[PDB]
Amino acid sequence: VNEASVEHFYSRAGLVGVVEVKDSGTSLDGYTVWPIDVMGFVQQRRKLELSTYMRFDAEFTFVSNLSNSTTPGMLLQYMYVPPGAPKPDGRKSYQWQTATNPSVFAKLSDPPPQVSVPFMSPATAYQWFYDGYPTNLQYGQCPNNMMGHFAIRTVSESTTGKNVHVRVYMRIKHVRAWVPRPLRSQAYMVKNYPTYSQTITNTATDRASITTTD
Amino acid sequence: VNEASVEHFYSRAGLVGVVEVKDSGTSLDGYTVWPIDVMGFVQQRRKLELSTYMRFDAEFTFVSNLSNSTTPGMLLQYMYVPPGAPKPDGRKSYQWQTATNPSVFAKLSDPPPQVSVPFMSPATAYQWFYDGYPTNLQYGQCPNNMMGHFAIRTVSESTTGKNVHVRVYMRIKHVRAWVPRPLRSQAYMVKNYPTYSQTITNTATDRASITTTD
Amino acid sequence: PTELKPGTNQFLTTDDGTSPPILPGFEPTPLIHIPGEFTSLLDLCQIETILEVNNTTGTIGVSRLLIPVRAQNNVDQLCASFQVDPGRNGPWQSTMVGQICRYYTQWSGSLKVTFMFTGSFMATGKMLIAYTPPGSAQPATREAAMLGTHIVWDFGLQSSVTLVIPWISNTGIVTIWYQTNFVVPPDTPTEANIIALGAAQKNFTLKLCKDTDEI
Amino acid sequence: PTELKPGTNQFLTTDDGTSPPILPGFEPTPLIHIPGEFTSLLDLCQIETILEVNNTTGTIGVSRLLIPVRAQNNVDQLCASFQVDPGRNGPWQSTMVGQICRYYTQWSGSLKVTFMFTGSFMATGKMLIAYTPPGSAQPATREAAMLGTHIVWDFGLQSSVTLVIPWISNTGIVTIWYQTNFVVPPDTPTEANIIALGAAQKNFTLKLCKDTDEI
Amino acid sequence: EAAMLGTHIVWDFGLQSSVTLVIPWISNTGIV
Amino acid sequence: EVQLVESGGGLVKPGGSLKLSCAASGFAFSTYDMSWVRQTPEKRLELVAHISSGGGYIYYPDTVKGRFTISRDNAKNTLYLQMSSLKSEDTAMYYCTRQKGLYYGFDYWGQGTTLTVSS
Amino acid sequence: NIVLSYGEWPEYCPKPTRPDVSVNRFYTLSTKSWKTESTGWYWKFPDVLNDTGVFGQNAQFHYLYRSGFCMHVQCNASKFHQGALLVAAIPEFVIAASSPLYPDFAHTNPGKDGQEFRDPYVLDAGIPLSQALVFPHQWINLRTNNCATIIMPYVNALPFDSALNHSNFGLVVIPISPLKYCNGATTEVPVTLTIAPLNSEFSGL
Amino acid sequence: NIVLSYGEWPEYCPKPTRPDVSVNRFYTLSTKSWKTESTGWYWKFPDVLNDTGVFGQNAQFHYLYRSGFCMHVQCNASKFHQGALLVAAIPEFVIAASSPLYPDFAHTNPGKDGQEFRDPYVLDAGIPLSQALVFPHQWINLRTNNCATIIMPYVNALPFDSALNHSNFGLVVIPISPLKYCNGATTEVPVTLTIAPLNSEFSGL
Amino acid sequence: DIVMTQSHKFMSTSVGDRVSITCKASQDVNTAVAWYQQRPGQSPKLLIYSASYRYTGVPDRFTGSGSGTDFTFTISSVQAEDLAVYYCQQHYTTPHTFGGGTKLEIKR
């Protein structure tokens, strides 16, 4: 009876997205920027749309290693670009320092970094469904949900030969949900819009007749 | 209403300067001395000149690694030369030991060193604007603001082949500000003097007429 | 002066730990009262949602929600039947409790099933709704059904009726029999349609969260 | 007997931690009272600073601070106008509140805008100062303006006047119309100059520190 | 749509078989 | 397809200053880093200056450091090079190139313009 | 008899003007005809009142407002007709497009005349209809009751928001069990609607 | 009417000699003529009193002092002149040089005759003028008031400091709105200044 | 800086033949190197960058290989259009540096 609570139901930490720097091979750029998308996986998306308005603090962790699952010591800079501030142009761009961009310097050898993001939205809660136009690409888009981009880079000075994979985990604390919504039957087409395929799929799997059971 | 406080406004830690030992290539010297300059970056300089007199304790951190962003264990000596004591001549100079020069011995493998400097000035507060001569190069120079040079060197005995970059972060605690000053419109020419370019730049971006808006 | 136990540096996926605030002295936008806050899924299981009892082949859509009933010129016949497992694939997939019981390995508790009658105001008849305990096959003919649990439901008087099933654990059958012919005065549509509504009672419980296959 | 959590050795840029004193037993030079201590930026937003309403092309300098007003031999004309966004590029960049609102992503609260009249003691006239709410275009002619918010400002009597704007969140226009001709006795300069002063009210607030682009 | 903005009453047969409309005023002109 | 043109190059006497301006069309011009490269009469090639895509980072070699200046305008699709105090060795032909980052190879090269420092 | 949405009465939020007076009167929208083939309708107000009455005169010229609605739907049919309707008020109702790409603006804000569903089974929002009872709803069952009434308070994240952009919610009428009538009976059963905004406010003329 | 700088009255700091007596008298500096073309003036005292009076006899022969000032600026013009001045006392006033390198000593300590600004818009310190109101200031507006008065206490880090080196602050008079007058009126409007040091102290003869 | 030196200021071959040029690094550059084609009176084109990988559109007869401080640029089949000066680059670190150049010779 305590596992039906909305607080426990959203509890556990999960994989929000996998990003890669890849500075070694044909792509030498040497950093990456990962806009925070909680909807990333269609499984995590279908449990969120259950509720229309929800207010929660997030907590992150970055599990990193090379392509060998081998983790030698080499330094990484995890920066958090808050919503409304400019993004880094290139691996040396002066945005990588500033002041106001909170950063985390962690070697690979260390156990994974961890950090806690507060509630960033202007409105008193997030909205997963916003009717009406922000001011037809525009229809139903919340401008106020952006949580920031978590730009990453490897401090070591020039062109290491090592592509560094990294995984990003999220978990939701202190969650509070408002008016409920029925779960989605139809498959998803694209990320930001509900649009569903022409051909409809039934909700229940058919049987022989209105009568026969099993 | 708590993010407008002068204490929070100067809070966050930032990059005061980047120094390099470079004992490997054409320059074999093997150490460096970095006079503490809070004004180092024109961004941090424009927020300080907001206030004329201010009194604060500082706290430092040194994030170090090789040119690969690779951090093998090798020993470093971070020494702090207090204001008014002689500087090291060369990597073996007897100043590197003495007594009164507080030092920090930290391997690269360890997480970054950290240390807390007190308030060093004779006067009850720093002065970012001092009129009048200390006794025309002299005009407007505070002799009493020197905070010390943070000389660094790598203990390993002779000519390692490794140039070691190092970054230096500062954050300001317990700050107290006095009489306010308007922000600087004109661009900076040189470090220690206000001197501004001949050609003046307007403060506001012009429009078509006194009338039209947007 | 401490020692480190064997479990030091592991990162455990369900951590329930603490973490540094990334932006100290930041002020979230304060709350205001928003109506409707729901604190637990176990209230949603208690609201009734239309059930697909039809779900046959080629039934297209929005016609799958209702079971047809007409004058079949036969006194004792089996109108429709469906087993009572909420989680198991079948009719109950269209309910609510059907869906959020795909997210939990085990459930329990009583269920409630409600019927409506859409037919015209003049029509009259009798349906015998009979429930079979989970360890038995569905009845042969009503004389076997009326011996078990049942309620005779009459149109002209009672337009909706509720059948509480006693128990389910983690199977049972409810059938709908014609008790009498379907009788109507002249100039009236001859066939009605019955819709069903599933819901869970108060004591329904869930256990051991698990992610689902629906998608 | 302890275990180490996943966040051990990270160096977090906004640390709010503690550090060893490098020189123990050292005595800072003690305080003395210095007048003027200011504890928060939000007092600076409340002092008025000259505003550049002119900011046109080729206006050189120190002439950008004041709007000219003369006898234009026309009764109803638009003297000058400027939108009310403090952060947005424009006139407000010369104020104080204009500058230290470039350091914060969001602001709010009422503003205050004050006018002075520099003309000679003999001169007389009437200006109609009208403010437009943020969701509308600036008025066509005064008959559209005098219907909105406005105050008629008279020279010979009142040499300075204050207009509080009700609200701003993170857009609005204030215009200055000639109500009547500019009337002067003989041997008097024919054109005056009006200067404006912006300031923030008590309830003005700031949020989410950010470094700026001004430099 | 112009009428329902003015004075009006919706009158329903199956329930109410008679209904009364008081006109506010007449002096010595108006339309229903 | 793509066009990199330059201008301003020509004979000049020692000490003078000259602005080489490069103009581009046929691609999105704010998404690429840019650079200058000069080819000595011996055809020895060497770098000149570098700027990031959005103006974040600007790099100068040690020889030209402080003597030159580079800037770009994403609105005008131009790349400007302000260069003064010309010595003898500053004569060579200057190419206007394009990159996707710091360490990517230079894919395109302007037709190049000569420069000459003499009395 | 009456369904208070989410168990609350709409109320003021303690200078915004309170019109009261003549925006508290009922408005009677045009009468939709429910045939045997017809499927669904929806409205999505604050929209429907933007043109009509003195209300639209407030909502067009004000930059912000707060409001709450009392809506009443009744269906006149003789006793020889059968069939049933589902009436539900679904907050934050965002529709979608079918694919073989966004919904045309005529489908987003229909106006006072409502709109027809393309796919009532999925609501044309993608969610199934069987579960749409989770929203506040009332059954109009032509052998029992002919009227359905709902009071929906003001539900939205911000205290105030504009009428020309964010449409606070929507309303659906879906004939779940189709209409049948014996020969000679009237072919169409009319459906009418009535809305009476409660506790409205406006600001920023 | 009177602006106390930073909301305080200058006071003694509880053997330094307190002269009182004849260093409390007003001093009347030479009268500057404000033309239509003229721009700005500044003084930067303790300087201005180093030569004059008995005060300069104290400040030259003492190694340390503490002081505070009451300064009064008034402008005599008939009612047919227009124009306005800004009067502000800006502590720790450090000037700069234009470039196409340091300011000549005549610009650092002008003396009793003040100095003209090269660039009044930027104050020739680099900071904009629009914001210079952040310092204690008073408006002299030739249609309203002809006088401006300021009391500036002793503001400096150390308790005492010498008069020949550190100039505690400065004073500016900038004609923000230029002067215009109809033909025949007097061509120049004079500006005068008066300073009366308060609570002075001296030590180390 | 870091100097990239090429062994041969000239090499001779004929059409259909196979020629391969080297490059030598002042220190360890990892795999970062690039090879350029400068035809007479023309802007030098990019061919092969970062050891083996070749830029989009370069014909397949152009190959390269190496690692560390020793590199190689291989022409499977020489053609007429192949006459021009070649250069090797170091993009491993800033500042970039180019080789002295190598000129082919077709002797008939």
Residue numbers in the entry:
A (entry chain A), B (entry chain A): 71 to 205, 214 to 292
C (entry chain C), D (entry chain C): 3 to 172, 189 to 233
E (entry chain C): 145 to 172, 189 to 192
F (entry chain H): 1 to 9, 11 to 30, 35 to 59, 62 to 72, 74 to 110, 112 to 128
G (entry chain B), H (entry chain B): 30 to 43, 52 to 137, 146 to 250
I (entry chain L): 1 to 29, 36 to 57, 65 to 72, 74 to 80, 83 to 109, 114 to 128
Sentences from the paper on this structure:
Although highly effective vaccines exist for EV71, no vaccine is available for the global public health threats imposed by CVA6, which underscores the critical need for developing an effective vaccine. Here, we demonstrate the isolation of two stable CVA6 particles with excellent natural antigenicity: one empty (CVA6 procapsid) and the other infectious (CVA6 A-particle). The capsid structures of CVA6 procapsid and A-particle at near atomic (~3 Å) resolution both closely resemble those of the uncoating intermediates of other enteroviruses. The cryoEM structures of the CVA6 procapsid, A-particle, and A-particle-1D5 immune-complex we report here reveal atomic resolution details about molecular determinants in CVA6 related to virus neutralization, cell binding, and RNA release.
We also used cryoEM and 3D image reconstruction methods to investigate the structure of the CVA6 A-particle in complex with the Fab portion of a previously identified neutralizing antibody (nAb) 1D536. A total of 12,067 particle images were extracted and subjected to 3D reconstruction yielding a final density map at an estimated resolution of 3.8 Å (FSC = 0.143)37. The density map shows that five Fab molecules encircle the topmost edge of the ‘cooling tower’ at each 5-fold vertex, and therefore a total of 60 Fab molecules can bind to each capsid. The interaction interface of Fab 1D5 involves five out of the six total complementary determining regions (CDR) and one framework region (FR) in the light chain: CDRL1, 2 and 3 and CDRH2, 3 and the FRL3 (between CDRL2 and CDRL3). Each Fab interacts with the BC, EF and HI loops of the nearest VP1 subunit and the DE loop of the counter-clockwise-related (viewed from outside the complex) VP1. This Fab-VP1 interaction includes an array of eight hydrogen bonds and van der Waals interactions. The five Fab molecules aligned at each vertex H-bond to each other via pairs of adjacent light chains. At least up to the resolution (3.8 Å) of our cryoEM map, Fab-1D5 binding induces no significant structural rearrangement of the CVA6 capsid as revealed by their superposition of the protomers in the CVA6 A-particle-1D5 complex and in A-particle and also reflected by the r.m.s.d. value of 0.4 Å between the Cα atoms of the two structures. Because the ring of five Fabs that encircle the tip of each 5-fold vertex are connected by intermolecular H-bonds, this may act to stabilize the capsid and prevent conformation changes required for genome release.
